[PDB]
Write a protein that binds this ligand. Sequence first.
Ligand SMILES: CO[C@H]1O[C@H](CO)[C@@H](O[C@H]2O[C@H](CO)[C@@H](O)[C@H](O)[C@@H]2O)[C@H](O)[C@@H]1O
Ligand SMILES: CO[C@H]1O[C@H](CO)[C@@H](O[C@H]2O[C@H](CO)[C@@H](O)[C@H](O)[C@@H]2O)[C@H](O)[C@@H]1O
Ligand SMILES: CO[C@H]1O[C@H](CO)[C@@H](O[C@H]2O[C@H](CO)[C@@H](O)[C@H](O)[C@@H]2O)[C@H](O)[C@@H]1O
Ligand SMILES: CO[C@H]1O[C@H](CO)[C@@H](O[C@H]2O[C@H](CO)[C@@H](O)[C@H](O)[C@@H]2O)[C@H](O)[C@@H]1O
Ligand SMILES: [Ca+2]
Ligand SMILES: [Ca+2]
Ligand SMILES: [Ca+2]
Ligand SMILES: [Ca+2]
Ligand SMILES: [Cl-]
Ligand SMILES: [Cl-]
Ligand SMILES: [Mn+2]
Ligand SMILES: [Mn+2]
Ligand SMILES: [Mn+2]
Ligand SMILES: [Mn+2]
Lengths: 237, 237, 237, 237
Amino acid sequence: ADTIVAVELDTYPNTDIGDPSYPHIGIDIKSVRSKKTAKWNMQNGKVGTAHIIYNSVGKRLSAVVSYPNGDSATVSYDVDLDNVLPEWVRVGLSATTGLYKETNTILSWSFTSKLKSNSTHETNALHFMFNQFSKDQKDLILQGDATTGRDGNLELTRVSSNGSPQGSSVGRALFYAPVHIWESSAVVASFDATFTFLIKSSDSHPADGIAFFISNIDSSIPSGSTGRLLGLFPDAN
Amino acid sequence: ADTIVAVELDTYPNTDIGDPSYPHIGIDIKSVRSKKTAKWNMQNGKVGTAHIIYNSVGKRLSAVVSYPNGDSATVSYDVDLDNVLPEWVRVGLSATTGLYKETNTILSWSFTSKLKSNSTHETNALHFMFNQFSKDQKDLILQGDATTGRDGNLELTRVSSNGSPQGSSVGRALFYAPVHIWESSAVVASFDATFTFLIKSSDSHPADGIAFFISNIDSSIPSGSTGRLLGLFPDAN
Amino acid sequence: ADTIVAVELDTYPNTDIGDPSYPHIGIDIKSVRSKKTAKWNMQNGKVGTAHIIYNSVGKRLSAVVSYPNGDSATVSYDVDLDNVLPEWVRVGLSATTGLYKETNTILSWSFTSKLKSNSTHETNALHFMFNQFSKDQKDLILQGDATTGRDGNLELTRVSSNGSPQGSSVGRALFYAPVHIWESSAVVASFDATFTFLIKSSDSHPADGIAFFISNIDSSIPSGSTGRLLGLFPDAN
Amino acid sequence: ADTIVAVELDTYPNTDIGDPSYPHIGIDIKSVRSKKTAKWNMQNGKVGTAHIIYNSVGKRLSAVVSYPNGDSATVSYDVDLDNVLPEWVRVGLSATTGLYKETNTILSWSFTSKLKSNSTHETNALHFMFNQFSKDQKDLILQGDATTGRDGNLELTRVSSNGSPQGSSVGRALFYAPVHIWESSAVVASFDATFTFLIKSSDSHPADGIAFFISNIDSSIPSGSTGRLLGLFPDAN
Ligand SMILES: CO[C@H]1O[C@H](CO)[C@@H](O[C@H]2O[C@H](CO)[C@@H](O)[C@H](O)[C@@H]2O)[C@H](O)[C@@H]1O
Ligand SMILES: CO[C@H]1O[C@H](CO)[C@@H](O[C@H]2O[C@H](CO)[C@@H](O)[C@H](O)[C@@H]2O)[C@H](O)[C@@H]1O
Ligand SMILES: CO[C@H]1O[C@H](CO)[C@@H](O[C@H]2O[C@H](CO)[C@@H](O)[C@H](O)[C@@H]2O)[C@H](O)[C@@H]1O
Ligand SMILES: CO[C@H]1O[C@H](CO)[C@@H](O[C@H]2O[C@H](CO)[C@@H](O)[C@H](O)[C@@H]2O)[C@H](O)[C@@H]1O
Ligand SMILES: [Ca+2]
Ligand SMILES: [Ca+2]
Ligand SMILES: [Ca+2]
Ligand SMILES: [Ca+2]
Ligand SMILES: [Cl-]
Ligand SMILES: [Cl-]
Ligand SMILES: [Mn+2]
Ligand SMILES: [Mn+2]
Ligand SMILES: [Mn+2]
Ligand SMILES: [Mn+2]
């Protein structure tokens, strides 16, 4: 029973399991069936940027995805995350391919967590930033088909020598250190995440997508969670 | 006239202008009559901390004030600030006394602003932090009775040689540089503010309060804005 | 008479004023005749990056300029800057051309200053970052030929309509707010600066260079400081 | 055999292994016999602060230790750390007692590291800050006697229920995630570290001290490294 909170860049509409009929960004609370979605125009071969924002005061998880184009999709969801997540978590990126496929290439990833207590001027904080991924990235936990180093990029799902994506692939990268996501005595608990991605496909349809996620610290890829399950959920319920 | 967005720590109930009948924190949008308030237990002689948070994605302005004993008050309000504030602003702190009085001592003040544009990896950012103020604080514009240096603090309103606060006082401190609070090509426009404060009084009722505010770059203390107007507004409409 | 400390990216050797006979980077303390230089291979048309570092403990002003190549040049100079600079300063970038010319385009600029006092914790900080420059950049003070907005860049020296640089040009940009660069009570005072630049020329000899500098707050371009004087110094003493 | 770089706050002069005949701060490169020391007027039972700065461009490691009254000791040493440390390291704090003893209490600890490659605008960074340590601090690896939670502090060496230090104790805390401290392509590989500590003793002479250190990721407490070896070294060579 892993616990997952995620923001999904979902490139392939699985209408049989509640996806909207178009590519979309979604906020997933413990389920692949997003609590909230917004229409997303995925630009093939373009570098996209995703921003994830949350604070325990406003209690609103917000995401926005944009392209140099200026086009962007935004989704927000009201939720008290310390009611959902355990006190300590790991943070990661996940992606899959299914019958259809795409590259799930991460060019950068940054994260910041802060816990500001009632004790005057006392903050715990964690911040990391990857603008380059080397072949042996020791501060990343790689699961499934994820690899690092290729062009200083992070490839979440399987890519061939020529740079062609493979189907039925799943990969995740988690930051090595546990993250203290909330604390009972913190007046403000907040976090921000940003990553840049390149999704390209020669298919009639790209699949299946990329997600930023927060999980219990021992989280691993659920069995058979390629394709529509985005490497996050054990079932589609 | 000035355009003001503010978070007020209001120590004195002026019920005839919409104040609730108790000390309170409020979010002010272009008026002294808060769009949203919350009951605040002001702790005389104790050091309090205010946190203000906003991002352009969730479009929710939040503030929490707390003391070391864990007592706190929180208020949130949904608003798109790019429809309220001009593109360039100055940020500041303001405080007043009236018939009744209190010290309006600031012990620290920090602010962070970020404009993340659609251009990949293109962020503009401003951040400052004061944990002490000196007698000649050149990066602060002091207006009214505000002074710096007294015990490394910032005294917003007038205080006598022995520490006794004066009545009918108003003072403000604004950060020297203009701040680019929003932009059209910005996918994210967030800001955070924090300050710590010491409000003490020997009156039966302390007055009138402290506020963090955001105004047009040429903002000045409106005529007659002492006491209940918190040095921010020309009138109580 | 201004007080100037600067790191020069000197593209044109003026041997009659103490320059080495090759393009170079140098540390200038109150004089255009560098206290220290190192040979620098400027790459026409490439985006370069300059990093400037200093702290009041090691007391070594250090600079490094690099290209994606990545060839790079480094220069360091042992000096106590709080013996040179005034307590409050402004920071800026400057560039010139003379009989020979080049573009002096700034693509980004960030700066961080910190004063850490003896009082446990208690830090004063200032940080800004520009990754794009709009036509009306209110938090910059532009001097001479300097303009902002052209492709979201900062052009320090004159550029014709077609993108060709003009000769005998001088321009500077300074951050709007005064910076508290040293303080007597501070145990650690440090600053860090970064900028990316694009110098391109069609001349047989590109000239004259770019500099990051720290000066007295009311610093302006000295008369006749184009070309070899880099807009920083009134003469070559 | 571990590789150690360290800044020691040495409270007990072990003159037989090269210690100066007074409490001192030192920079240790692979040896308990400091490459550089400075006299340190240690203040029993007072809260002190250590700042550590590595300037990778200047190749200069510096440390300053101070108390609220302003008294400070400083030490600098020239070294290029990519010649000493492996590419990946862990960072941590260490402390010991021997025949003589002292509390080795850590009240706060922050660390910031930055690898800036030659690829334009590509910076990897890690930052963490602890202003309080909980009883279950999942992002720290505790070794030997080190414990967390007591008054929100980190106790590196054994302390009794009534706050009295024990002799012949050794304990270390390492940040969980491996740190990429240098890389071939990196033009800048600097870091800063800060911690606040409380050393108290009823002994005539407190011993043995506290160190901030950097080591190979699999570093553990060397056999019989209590007392003068500060839990860092296997012997006094
Ligand atoms: C209806 O079932 C068929 O078609 C499905 C596609 O709609 C296909 O789903 C696979 O591929 C999709 C896209 O990659 C992925 O989302 C699913 O998880 C699954 O792997 C079915 O396999 C059938 O062909
Ligand atoms: C008509 O109200 C009388 O009493 C008021 C106080 O309740 C007083 O208000 C003054 O003082 C308050 C508190 O300092 C301040 O909020 C007002 O703006 C004003 O300065 C009125 O003046 C009357 O005496
Ligand atoms: C006397 O030297 C002659 O040639 C010099 C270099 O061509 C020239 O210097 C001008 O241009 C250089 C390079 O742009 C600049 O550094 C000087 O400040 C000056 O403007 C002299 O003027 C002579 O022509
Ligand atoms: C000379 O050797 C004796 O005295 C030594 C120090 O006085 C003592 O060293 C022990 O205690 C010190 C201080 O705690 C510590 O630095 C050593 O590592 C060792 O633990 C010797 O044991 C002798 O008594
Ligand atoms: Ca889907
Ligand atoms: Ca009021
Ligand atoms: Ca020259
Ligand atoms: Ca010793
Ligand atoms: Cl240094
Ligand atoms: Cl060396
Ligand atoms: Mn979906
Ligand atoms: Mn009110
Ligand atoms: Mn020169
Ligand atoms: Mn020693």
